[PDB]
């Protein structure tokens, strides 16, 4: 009770006649609201995995992302989803991380050979065709779609590479037509015995197994270069309440205070207004403006 | 030739609303009563981009159509190219090799390489135009103001238009011109082609303390330089 | 702890958990390990439909680099307030003056 608190603030069991400042009343906030602008520039990964055309193993493309807002939570609506072993980063916390630029690697991989593309692995296409670094940040998107992209007359248009003598370092390509050198042999220029030219092709069939199936492998990669980040992930939910002591957070600027309608005419480039002696007076809504 | 800039070069440094208070800002502004370089369009040399350039132009036929930025004109390092048009602007930082003279709109003077960034927005463009370019914190800022009309005595605050997240090293810059029916070669002479009679201005920013007077509606009505 | 605990084709008895529903308060432990998910779909989704088993087996070999060799770490918890204490060094006493 305020009598014994007055005995508490002066450290004496008996108080005399007079007015005493004991404490300071302060209203605790009830709710907390965060707001962010609209998802205008949505990310065009719909060109990547929802497309029908795809590249080969050695002829993979690299499609970069400059400025977008991301959305990976809606990407899980696909039915052949079965592999998402992410590398370094948990898939839950990636939605809040904001990076600089995103590169995608789109190709098709033999479904028995999908375990070779992993950090700390050795295999056929891993050491000779395509490898990821051990400091890689990203995941693999692999799914089977043999019901749509194949026919019984032979879907051997997707080509691949089995072997070569050297080892390709990652982040380059080769469309080089190089002759096999076994030993004491000159180059002829035409195919034949011990001139094993590596132009190969797979054996895509619609009924070709359940584990030896075409897995459309998309390896999406995230890069940082100690720069100001451009590619932002899916933002938090936006909710708004007025005339109540709530926590406000409009692109930062976290605090406690009520929100009331104003009457002034602000300039369009202003984002948050500051009163005298460095106190925030007014912040405009990033959604409804 | 030279011209003294009387009260120009004042922009919004903090993008906040302040109603009828005076703010002492310590940033980079053009000092008052300082000289700027004056040019006449009726060939341009390269000018250094030290730590920020205030650009000014009074035109009546829209003959300048952008700028070129970058620490080098060669294709070894990433340069910047901003060209304006009648409908839109394209901001393009991707390190193309440029000629010894800028192009006159032959609608191409650039080659191919690793290309990185591209930007579409609203069009940036007697008619007076002012522009300020800054790169201190790795963010490209342009403050502009178009007032109908040497340089006038009227005060005018310059509002921020765009803010790019590119942080390219900039050391040199170069202006753009445009002329009717102009063909260009990799090897250019000093003759050129005829255009409208106009002029443009180039200033330089220095770190100065400025006390900006804000109005009731958040507009800057007057400014006072400390070391003047 | 490379010569003692790291095994070839084994060393799977030590477990580690990849996620948790909330940040655990300090000096606490948990033994039960039911499968947790995103909430709107049931458990046993270890195939990859947005569900993970928390306790994963590492099973690494000594061919790896120094960043992921198993380090047998032991933390000592102390409280240095004024209280009746009976655990300190072998420093002898001196008769009372
Ligand atoms: C991309 O695929 C997903 C999964 O089926 C689908 O929900 C989405 O609508 C597709 N996007 C398109 C067709 O633009
Ligand atoms: C965001 O979306 C809402 C609803 O579509 C709209 O009313 C509002 O004007 C939008 N804001 C911006 C800045 O586009
Ligand atoms: C092209 O630019 C990118 C990023 O600026 C760089 O990683 C790449 O090496 C460049 N290519 C060259 C210089 O051939
Ligand atoms: C930027 O350019 C200047 C002048 O050419 C040079 O002194 C400086 O080292 C450059 N900085 C970087 C990061 O390249
Ligand atoms: C501020 O704006 C209001 C609304 O347009 C206007 O009535 C008033 O005159 C302006 N005040 C000044 C000092 O410009
Ligand atoms: C007690 O158990 C609850 C429920 O599992 C848990 O949240 C809490 O952290 C535990 N506290 C301690 C001290 O172990």
GROMACS .gro file of N, CA and C in nm, chain A residues 37-123:
model
  261
   37UNK      N    1   0.684  -0.232  -4.546
   37UNK     CA    2   0.615  -0.205  -4.674
   37UNK      C    3   0.574  -0.332  -4.747
   38UNK      N    4   0.503  -0.311  -4.858
   38UNK     CA    5   0.444  -0.420  -4.935
   38UNK      C    6   0.551  -0.503  -5.006
   39UNK      N    7   0.511  -0.624  -5.044
   39UNK     CA    8   0.597  -0.712  -5.124
   39UNK      C    9   0.569  -0.678  -5.270
   40UNK      N   10   0.636  -0.575  -5.319
   40UNK     CA   11   0.615  -0.527  -5.456
   40UNK      C   12   0.701  -0.604  -5.556
   41UNK      N   13   0.833  -0.599  -5.538
   41UNK     CA   14   0.925  -0.671  -5.625
   41UNK      C   15   0.940  -0.810  -5.564
   42UNK      N   16   0.847  -0.898  -5.601
   42UNK     CA   17   0.857  -1.037  -5.560
   42UNK      C   18   0.968  -1.107  -5.638
   43UNK      N   19   1.028  -1.208  -5.577
   43UNK     CA   20   1.144  -1.271  -5.637
   43UNK      C   21   1.101  -1.363  -5.751
   44UNK      N   22   1.166  -1.356  -5.868
   44UNK     CA   23   1.131  -1.442  -5.982
   44UNK      C   24   1.202  -1.577  -5.984
   45UNK      N   25   1.181  -1.657  -5.878
   45UNK     CA   26   1.223  -1.797  -5.885
   45UNK      C   27   1.125  -1.882  -5.965
   46UNK      N   28   1.011  -1.825  -6.005
   46UNK     CA   29   0.916  -1.896  -6.090
   46UNK      C   30   0.973  -1.923  -6.229
   47UNK      N   31   1.072  -1.844  -6.272
   47UNK     CA   32   1.149  -1.875  -6.392
   47UNK      C   33   1.244  -1.993  -6.371
   48UNK      N   34   1.277  -2.027  -6.247
   48UNK     CA   35   1.382  -2.124  -6.221
   48UNK      C   36   1.326  -2.266  -6.214
   49UNK      N   37   1.237  -2.291  -6.117
   49UNK     CA   38   1.191  -2.428  -6.094
   49UNK      C   39   1.055  -2.458  -6.156
   50UNK      N   40   0.974  -2.356  -6.184
   50UNK     CA   41   0.845  -2.377  -6.248
   50UNK      C   42   0.853  -2.377  -6.400
   51UNK      N   43   0.972  -2.362  -6.457
   51UNK     CA   44   0.987  -2.363  -6.602
   51UNK      C   45   0.992  -2.506  -6.655
   52UNK      N   46   0.968  -2.519  -6.785
   52UNK     CA   47   0.970  -2.649  -6.852
   52UNK      C   48   1.104  -2.677  -6.920
   53UNK      N   49   1.171  -2.575  -6.973
   53UNK     CA   50   1.305  -2.591  -7.028
   53UNK      C   51   1.408  -2.599  -6.916
   54UNK      N   52   1.507  -2.686  -6.935
   54UNK     CA   53   1.615  -2.705  -6.839
   54UNK      C   54   1.746  -2.726  -6.914
   55UNK      N   55   1.856  -2.708  -6.841
   55UNK     CA   56   1.991  -2.718  -6.897
   55UNK      C   57   2.050  -2.856  -6.871
   56UNK      N   58   2.166  -2.880  -6.932
   56UNK     CA   59   2.236  -3.007  -6.916
   56UNK      C   60   2.329  -3.000  -6.796
   57UNK      N   61   2.411  -3.105  -6.780
   57UNK     CA   62   2.500  -3.114  -6.664
   57UNK      C   63   2.618  -3.019  -6.680
   58UNK      N   64   2.684  -3.024  -6.796
   58UNK     CA   65   2.798  -2.935  -6.820
   58UNK      C   66   2.755  -2.799  -6.873
   59UNK      N   67   2.635  -2.787  -6.928
   59UNK     CA   68   2.586  -2.663  -6.987
   59UNK      C   69   2.489  -2.589  -6.895
   60UNK      N   70   2.516  -2.593  -6.765
   60UNK     CA   71   2.431  -2.527  -6.666
   60UNK      C   72   2.441  -2.375  -6.675
   61UNK      N   73   2.328  -2.309  -6.655
   61UNK     CA   74   2.325  -2.163  -6.650
   61UNK      C   75   2.339  -2.114  -6.507
   62UNK      N   76   2.368  -1.984  -6.493
   62UNK     CA   77   2.381  -1.919  -6.363
   62UNK      C   78   2.301  -1.788  -6.368
   63UNK      N   79   2.186  -1.787  -6.300
   63UNK     CA   80   2.093  -1.675  -6.303
   63UNK      C   81   2.097  -1.602  -6.170
   64UNK      N   82   2.131  -1.473  -6.173
   64UNK     CA   83   2.155  -1.397  -6.051
   64UNK      C   84   2.035  -1.311  -6.014
   65UNK      N   85   2.027  -1.275  -5.886
   65UNK     CA   86   1.919  -1.194  -5.831
   65UNK      C   87   1.982  -1.069  -5.771
   66UNK      N   88   1.935  -0.952  -5.813
   66UNK     CA   89   1.989  -0.824  -5.767
   66UNK      C   90   1.903  -0.760  -5.658
   67UNK      N   91   1.778  -0.729  -5.688
   67UNK     CA   92   1.689  -0.658  -5.596
   67UNK      C   93   1.552  -0.725  -5.598
   68UNK      N   94   1.512  -0.782  -5.484
   68UNK     CA   95   1.385  -0.851  -5.471
   68UNK      C   96   1.350  -0.866  -5.324
   69UNK      N   97   1.225  -0.907  -5.299
   69UNK     CA   98   1.186  -0.963  -5.170
   69UNK      C   99   1.163  -1.113  -5.190
   70UNK      N  100   1.208  -1.192  -5.093
   70UNK     CA  101   1.208  -1.337  -5.106
   70UNK      C  102   1.085  -1.398  -5.041
   71UNK      N  103   1.053  -1.521  -5.083
   71UNK     CA  104   0.944  -1.598  -5.024
   71UNK      C  105   0.975  -1.746  -5.048
   72UNK      N  106   1.031  -1.812  -4.946
   72UNK     CA  107   1.056  -1.956  -4.954
   72UNK      C  108   0.951  -2.040  -4.884
   73UNK      N  109   0.861  -1.978  -4.807
   73UNK     CA  110   0.759  -2.055  -4.737
   73UNK      C  111   0.648  -2.101  -4.831
   74UNK      N  112   0.621  -2.025  -4.937
   74UNK     CA  113   0.522  -2.067  -5.036
   74UNK      C  114   0.579  -2.163  -5.139
   75UNK      N  115   0.710  -2.185  -5.139
   75UNK     CA  116   0.772  -2.276  -5.235
   75UNK      C  117   0.753  -2.423  -5.198
   76UNK      N  118   0.698  -2.452  -5.080
   76UNK     CA  119   0.683  -2.590  -5.036
   76UNK      C  120   0.550  -2.651  -5.079
   77UNK      N  121   0.477  -2.586  -5.169
   77UNK     CA  122   0.352  -2.639  -5.222
   77UNK      C  123   0.374  -2.747  -5.328
   78UNK      N  124   0.498  -2.768  -5.372
   78UNK     CA  125   0.527  -2.867  -5.475
   78UNK      C  126   0.513  -3.008  -5.419
   79UNK      N  127   0.449  -3.095  -5.496
   79UNK     CA  128   0.425  -3.235  -5.462
   79UNK      C  129   0.549  -3.326  -5.462
   80UNK      N  130   0.643  -3.321  -5.558
   80UNK     CA  131   0.760  -3.410  -5.549
   80UNK      C  132   0.871  -3.363  -5.456
   81UNK      N  133   0.842  -3.273  -5.361
   81UNK     CA  134   0.938  -3.234  -5.259
   81UNK      C  135   0.979  -3.353  -5.173
   82UNK      N  136   1.108  -3.387  -5.175
   82UNK     CA  137   1.162  -3.488  -5.084
   82UNK      C  138   1.304  -3.464  -5.035
   83UNK      N  139   1.379  -3.370  -5.090
   83UNK     CA  140   1.518  -3.347  -5.049
   83UNK      C  141   1.541  -3.199  -5.022
   84UNK      N  142   1.574  -3.165  -4.898
   84UNK     CA  143   1.613  -3.028  -4.864
   84UNK      C  144   1.719  -3.027  -4.754
   85UNK      N  145   1.829  -3.099  -4.774
   85UNK     CA  146   1.937  -3.098  -4.675
   85UNK      C  147   2.014  -2.968  -4.695
   86UNK      N  148   1.984  -2.867  -4.613
   86UNK     CA  149   2.049  -2.738  -4.625
   86UNK      C  150   2.188  -2.742  -4.564
   87UNK      N  151   2.270  -2.644  -4.600
   87UNK     CA  152   2.413  -2.648  -4.575
   87UNK      C  153   2.453  -2.524  -4.496
   88UNK      N  154   2.483  -2.543  -4.367
   88UNK     CA  155   2.529  -2.434  -4.283
   88UNK      C  156   2.419  -2.355  -4.215
   89UNK      N  157   2.312  -2.326  -4.288
   89UNK     CA  158   2.204  -2.240  -4.241
   89UNK      C  159   2.079  -2.325  -4.222
   90UNK      N  160   2.011  -2.304  -4.105
   90UNK     CA  161   1.885  -2.375  -4.086
   90UNK      C  162   1.776  -2.313  -4.173
   91UNK      N  163   1.682  -2.393  -4.223
   91UNK     CA  164   1.580  -2.337  -4.315
   91UNK      C  165   1.478  -2.247  -4.248
   92UNK      N  166   1.468  -2.250  -4.115
   92UNK     CA  167   1.373  -2.162  -4.045
   92UNK      C  168   1.426  -2.020  -4.034
   93UNK      N  169   1.555  -2.004  -4.003
   93UNK     CA  170   1.611  -1.872  -3.977
   93UNK      C  171   1.652  -1.798  -4.104
   94UNK      N  172   1.646  -1.864  -4.220
   94UNK     CA  173   1.688  -1.799  -4.345
   94UNK      C  174   1.588  -1.693  -4.388
   95UNK      N  175   1.463  -1.704  -4.342
   95UNK     CA  176   1.358  -1.609  -4.380
   95UNK      C  177   1.379  -1.470  -4.321
   96UNK      N  178   1.455  -1.458  -4.213
   96UNK     CA  179   1.487  -1.328  -4.154
   96UNK      C  180   1.620  -1.273  -4.201
   97UNK      N  181   1.708  -1.358  -4.254
   97UNK     CA  182   1.838  -1.312  -4.301
   97UNK      C  183   1.823  -1.234  -4.432
   98UNK      N  184   1.901  -1.128  -4.445
   98UNK     CA  185   1.898  -1.041  -4.562
   98UNK      C  186   2.038  -1.037  -4.623
   99UNK      N  187   2.050  -1.085  -4.746
   99UNK     CA  188   2.178  -1.102  -4.814
   99UNK      C  189   2.192  -1.004  -4.930
  100UNK      N  190   2.308  -1.010  -4.995
  100UNK     CA  191   2.341  -0.915  -5.101
  100UNK      C  192   2.295  -0.961  -5.239
  101UNK      N  193   2.334  -1.081  -5.281
  101UNK     CA  194   2.295  -1.133  -5.411
  101UNK      C  195   2.286  -1.285  -5.408
  102UNK      N  196   2.195  -1.339  -5.489
  102UNK     CA  197   2.165  -1.482  -5.492
  102UNK      C  198   2.191  -1.535  -5.632
  103UNK      N  199   2.265  -1.645  -5.641
  103UNK     CA  200   2.290  -1.716  -5.766
  103UNK      C  201   2.223  -1.853  -5.763
  104UNK      N  202   2.164  -1.891  -5.876
  104UNK     CA  203   2.099  -2.021  -5.892
  104UNK      C  204   2.175  -2.104  -5.995
  105UNK      N  205   2.182  -2.235  -5.969
  105UNK     CA  206   2.245  -2.331  -6.060
  105UNK      C  207   2.140  -2.434  -6.099
  106UNK      N  208   2.097  -2.432  -6.225
  106UNK     CA  209   1.987  -2.515  -6.272
  106UNK      C  210   2.038  -2.619  -6.371
  107UNK      N  211   2.020  -2.747  -6.337
  107UNK     CA  212   2.059  -2.858  -6.422
  107UNK      C  213   1.977  -2.981  -6.381
  108UNK      N  214   2.002  -3.093  -6.448
  108UNK     CA  215   1.938  -3.220  -6.416
  108UNK      C  216   2.045  -3.322  -6.381
  109UNK      N  217   2.019  -3.402  -6.279
  109UNK     CA  218   2.114  -3.499  -6.226
  109UNK      C  219   2.045  -3.636  -6.220
  110UNK      N  220   2.122  -3.740  -6.253
  110UNK     CA  221   2.086  -3.879  -6.228
  110UNK      C  222   2.046  -3.899  -6.082
  111UNK      N  223   1.933  -3.967  -6.062
  111UNK     CA  224   1.874  -3.978  -5.929
  111UNK      C  225   1.950  -4.066  -5.833
  112UNK      N  226   2.036  -4.154  -5.884
  112UNK     CA  227   2.125  -4.232  -5.799
  112UNK      C  228   2.251  -4.155  -5.764
  113UNK      N  229   2.285  -4.054  -5.845
  113UNK     CA  230   2.405  -3.974  -5.828
  113UNK      C  231   2.382  -3.843  -5.754
  114UNK      N  232   2.265  -3.824  -5.691
  114UNK     CA  233   2.237  -3.698  -5.623
  114UNK      C  234   2.309  -3.687  -5.489
  115UNK      N  235   2.361  -3.797  -5.436
  115UNK     CA  236   2.428  -3.792  -5.306
  115UNK      C  237   2.573  -3.745  -5.319
  116UNK      N  238   2.626  -3.738  -5.441
  116UNK     CA  239   2.765  -3.696  -5.457
  116UNK      C  240   2.783  -3.546  -5.441
  117UNK      N  241   2.681  -3.466  -5.473
  117UNK     CA  242   2.691  -3.321  -5.459
  117UNK      C  243   2.655  -3.289  -5.314
  118UNK      N  244   2.759  -3.283  -5.231
  118UNK     CA  245   2.751  -3.265  -5.086
  118UNK      C  246   2.890  -3.226  -5.036
  119UNK      N  247   2.900  -3.149  -4.928
  119UNK     CA  248   3.033  -3.113  -4.875
  119UNK      C  249   3.101  -3.234  -4.812
  120UNK      N  250   3.222  -3.264  -4.860
  120UNK     CA  251   3.297  -3.378  -4.811
  120UNK      C  252   3.258  -3.508  -4.879
  121UNK      N  253   3.247  -3.507  -5.011
  121UNK     CA  254   3.205  -3.623  -5.088
  121UNK      C  255   3.294  -3.641  -5.210
  122UNK      N  256   3.304  -3.766  -5.256
  122UNK     CA  257   3.378  -3.800  -5.377
  122UNK      C  258   3.290  -3.887  -5.466
  123UNK      N  259   3.305  -3.871  -5.597
  123UNK     CA  260   3.224  -3.948  -5.690
  123UNK      C  261   3.261  -3.929  -5.835
   0.00000   0.00000   0.00000
